[PDB]
Design a protein around this ligand. Sequence first.
Ligand SMILES: [Ca+2]
Length: 281
Amino acid sequence: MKAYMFPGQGSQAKGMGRALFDAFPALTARADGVLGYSIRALCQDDPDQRLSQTQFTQPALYVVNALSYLKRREEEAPPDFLAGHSLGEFSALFAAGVFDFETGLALVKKRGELMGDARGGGMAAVIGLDEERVRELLDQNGATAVDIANLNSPSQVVISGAKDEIARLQVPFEAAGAKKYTVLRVSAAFHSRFMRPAMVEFGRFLEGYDFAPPKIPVISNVTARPCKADGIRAALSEQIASPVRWCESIRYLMGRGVEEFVECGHGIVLTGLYAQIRRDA
Ligand SMILES: [Ca+2]
């Protein structure tokens, strides 16, 4: 059995998707229709570093992920399971037939606007400590406005919360054995109950759409279990205010009997996470 993994923010790069745009002109033009700019120019030329601005990053990654998937479906057998990292979930649900290409793109455009417009708090990526050790350190250092935002591998965790606490935790984390601690360039403390207003707004936005049942199961970042057909809105809206349970999602699939994990989209970010999850499991 085989799973496709769709990457999210952080995996974008100038020049990405070039060959896919060439091969899928209809979807390239349809994407332009939703966005109002050339999607190819955004990805290839990266005008004014817009690719690092989340309201453009998210559409770019969605389109490249979606076209990467369709290329794979022409050339090899369908996957048995799908999973996407944050933005990646939207491309996973597109692949599963939950919504059409345009709808998915409209949803990520809105997601990018909400997250770009978000204010308050920050985030840091931590390499070299497990979840338990991270939780212990937050406690020990009195960081009661900081929580775990991403569980990406057994040694890769993202934390999220009050800006001053995110700053102050760096040295103690490094002294505890973190191989790297990097304060991220983001608008706000994503993936905490802090983002509840954005969650509510996105949920209400999603009421205006009509979804179809997934034809291939999609593992939710919120639950680390397959999305229910009647729970698409909760899975997508609550995701932005909930911890991203990526490591658990991959372990769930391994426990189900999935042996092959393939990254579907630009880069090798999820491939590297998979190597670490598999090495530990
Ligand atoms: Ca509806």
